[PDB]
Amino acid sequence: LLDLSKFKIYYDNNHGYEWWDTAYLDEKGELMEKYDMNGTSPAEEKLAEDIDEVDDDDDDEHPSIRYVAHPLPEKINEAKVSIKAYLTQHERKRLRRNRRKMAREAREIKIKLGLLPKPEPKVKLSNMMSVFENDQNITDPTAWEKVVKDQVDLRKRKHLEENERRHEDAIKRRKEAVNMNVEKPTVYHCKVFQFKNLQNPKIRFKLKMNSKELSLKGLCLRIRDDGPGIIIVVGNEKSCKFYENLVMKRIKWNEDFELHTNTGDIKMDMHNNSISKTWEGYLQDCKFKGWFMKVCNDQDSLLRTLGQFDSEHFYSPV
Amino acid sequence: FFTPATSELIFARRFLINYSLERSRKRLQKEMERHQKFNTRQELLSRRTELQRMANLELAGSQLVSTKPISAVSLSTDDMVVATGSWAGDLQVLNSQTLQPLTQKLDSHVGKIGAIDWHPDSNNQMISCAEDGLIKNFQYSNEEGGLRLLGDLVGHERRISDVKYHPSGKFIGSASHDMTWRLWDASTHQELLLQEGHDKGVFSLSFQCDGSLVCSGGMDSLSMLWDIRSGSKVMTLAGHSKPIYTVAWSPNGYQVATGGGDGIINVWDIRKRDEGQLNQILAHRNIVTQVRFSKEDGGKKLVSCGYDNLINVYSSDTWLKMGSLAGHTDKIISLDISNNSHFLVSGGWDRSIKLWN
Amino acid sequence: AKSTENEIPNLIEKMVAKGLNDLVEQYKFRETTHSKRELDSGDDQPQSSEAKRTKFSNPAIPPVIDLEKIK
Amino acid sequence: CPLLWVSLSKIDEIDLKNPVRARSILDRGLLKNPDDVLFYIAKIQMEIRLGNLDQAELLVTQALQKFPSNALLWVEQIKLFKHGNKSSLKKTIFQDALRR
Amino acid sequence: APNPKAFPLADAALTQQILDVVQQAANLRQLKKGANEATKTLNRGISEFIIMAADCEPIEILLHLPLLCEDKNVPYVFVPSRVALGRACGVSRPVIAASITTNDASAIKTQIYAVKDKIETLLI
């Protein structure tokens, strides 16, 4: 039975009456006939409402010849991206001057009339010898040195501490911030790449992790593991670009690699394998919920999978 | 909603309906006949052959033309010559195969030429549009001079993108960066329609070859399908995201195809009531500039050029990249397919017209 | 306008304070434009911390408030 | 191998009076390998040979955009300039070429 | 509302991107403010793309630049605000035209290229 099946398949291959490498061309007649019947007018769905009807010199009543429509032009909701108003260098400088000046003034007031702190002389190892406001400068020379060096360290330490604090706070913000930002995406850049093979783990890993990083909606489908397959990537434009770069410049697909298994480590020479950017467009609605990489046993299956997002058209069989 | 009228339009509208209807009926009959006499094998084989031919087109000859790039390239109905409008505003005409110029005409359009269409009635009163904001008929001659203008038609306020000739020959459609697309008379050279139906411009018109339904591809991505007669629409904007820079019917009224800025060519207005795309197509990496078909004269075969430096061909049942045409050095902005055979004539930012054979 | 009415005294000082706030929120290119400040306020909103920093900015951008307090 | 292509173009243009074919050939060559500047240079030369100079200039510009440092392109540009349409922006152009 | 002959006017996001690029360009000394400078750039061939102002009044002082670009095969846009453009460039005064220039070794090359591509897409 198996043999028979194989034979049949072979027969089909040599000259198929319709084969699913490239979708079927032939027009079914029965359906057409049915459509025609439905129409009933010898013209089409469009003209059907003229319905073999004649008024005066061929005119029609149900659709009026007289009137010209001026229907409501649907205004698209343009997202008000508040413009990054820049500053001239000079303006920036002025700002810096003024705020800083104000701060200084405040300090003066809050160190003169307030007396909230008191400003001590900023010693160093060069001032060390000439500062006498703090006592012990020759009296307790090593002590003095310790004090001054210590002070310096504190200053440096303080700076470093401040930096650390900043780093911390920023980190804290970022996690929260990301969570907060569930903005409504207006338009999605997309890129679909297809490849002859990816029996390399490394490449697959790269595809995964990068996608995860970049919030890149899409997928990576393929036929028979070793067979040819498609990457679809969708997202913000920069991310897409990055992905493309990774695919083309960073990864070497033609490079040789090792497959690790329980039986033995299999060296894979794949000079034949390559990658091409099939598409590089903009999609109206991005139906890809995440980055659902897959393998399929056959082409039909792959197509079906693709059409889970109402988009089989991405795959290009060659 | 907001509905006035005109008498000239009415006079013409009836004619349009008659003409459209009869032709439509004929087309339907032809279609019926075709399926009735078809068989699985031979037709399929023929299709395959055609596809192969399309694939193995190669850049035959590139004749440089203008100072700036070549917006429009339009082959005649007779298909002997091609008319090629540059951004400079000159529509040099070339004997298609040899691809040598006949004349130059810089003084015609001051602005960027939009699109040129030859008259479907053999008698070659080719129309052309521009950013100049007007359409111009040019009665073409082989012997005496190159061209001579007949009628200018100042109706549009803003720059025009595309003109077409309604299959009859009695009407000229002109779609523009202004809100409207306007249908004109061929005889008197005066208006009749103006469909205010887009928030931005109408970048392309295309008349269905029966002469009933016109697609107005807008810069809003609202590709509208206006019945000329009713003044009413059966639209789907749901195709495109970016502007719809081109649109063209498969001559079998069966299909419109709107080519986009998004790059996706959407192909629709089908027998199906839900109006669903049997397929979309991934046309060009960058934008699509022109989409054409060629079932007038021969079989239906999508050919498209884009800002990707690649004209490419799709079978109009499957919708699949049957093969790219590396030929242009730079962007490609227009493209016409020979009515009869396999012979593409396309123009671009290379500032040259190019043949494929 | 409504927003301006309730919380915002809408002088130069107030504007300055607002600007400062966005910088502390974490600005690079001059925060955002202000048609009547309403837009700016809206933009700030995501940060969600308006009223504290204007009560601080008048203590700094002059010291008059501080002086008053002292006296 | 651009040389072969160039030769073919020459044959098309000079021997038989049909530049169009030559141009097409050149284009094809270019498409077959856009990595090399040689094809571009050849095309430019061809353009120069015939009356069309604006086109040549455009080509040169394109080449520069693609590969700026290539000296042959610069040379071609210089040659074009020397023709004497500008007879100006000449020294500046030279300087630019030198820089690049 | 903006002038019709100012074309192609860049879409909001696109405009913003362009402005950002300009700012970067300004920082890098890669940019050349002003009609005349822009014109010079075009003549040279250094211009990567030309950024114009829709609210330039009188518009027709601008409208040679587009022609020049067309003749040179250089992408060009209009943004809507001259003031904004000026700010981006780093000039409190209204700038109407600018050129981001060529320099292979720039950090912002990629950015510039992207913008150019966008501009090209706009044109038709």
Structure notes:
- Chain A is α+β, with helices and mostly antiparallel strands and 318 residues long.
- In chain A, 39% of the residues lie in helices and 11% in strands.
- Chain A folds into 3 domains: 1-25, no CATH class; 83-185, no CATH class; 186-317, no CATH class.
- Chain A has 7 helices and 7 strands.
- In chain A, strands 1, 2, 3, 6 and 7 form a 5-stranded antiparallel sheet that branches. In chain A, strands 4-5 form a two-stranded antiparallel sheet.
- Chain A starts with a helix and ends in a 12-residue tail after the last helix.
- Chain B has one domain (62-357).
- With 100 residues, chain D is an all-alpha fold.
- Chain D contains 6 helices and no strands.
- The longest helix of chain D is centred in the N-terminal third of the chain and has 14 residues, at 2-15.
- Chain D is globular and about 40 Å long.
- Chain E is of the alpha+beta class and 124 residues long.
- Chain E has one domain: Ribosomal protein L30/S12 (60s Ribosomal Protein L30, Chain: A, 2-Layer Sandwich).
- In chain E, 47% of the residues lie in helices and 15% in strands.
- Chain E has 5 helices and 4 strands, in the order H-E-H-E-H-E-H-E-H.
- Chain E has helices spanning 12-27, 35-44, 64-72, 82-89, 109-123; strands at residues 31-33, 47-53, 76-79, 98-101.
- The chains are: A alpha+beta (318), B mainly beta (357), C mainly alpha (71), D mainly alpha (100), E alpha+beta (124).
- At the A-B interface, helix 2, strand 6 and strand 7 of A face helix 1, helix 2, strand 16 and strand 20 of B.
- It is classed as transcription.
- The entry lists the keywords snRNP, RNA-protein complex.
- Body region of the U4/U6.U5 tri-snRNP.
- Chain A is U4/U6 small nuclear ribonucleoprotein PRP3.
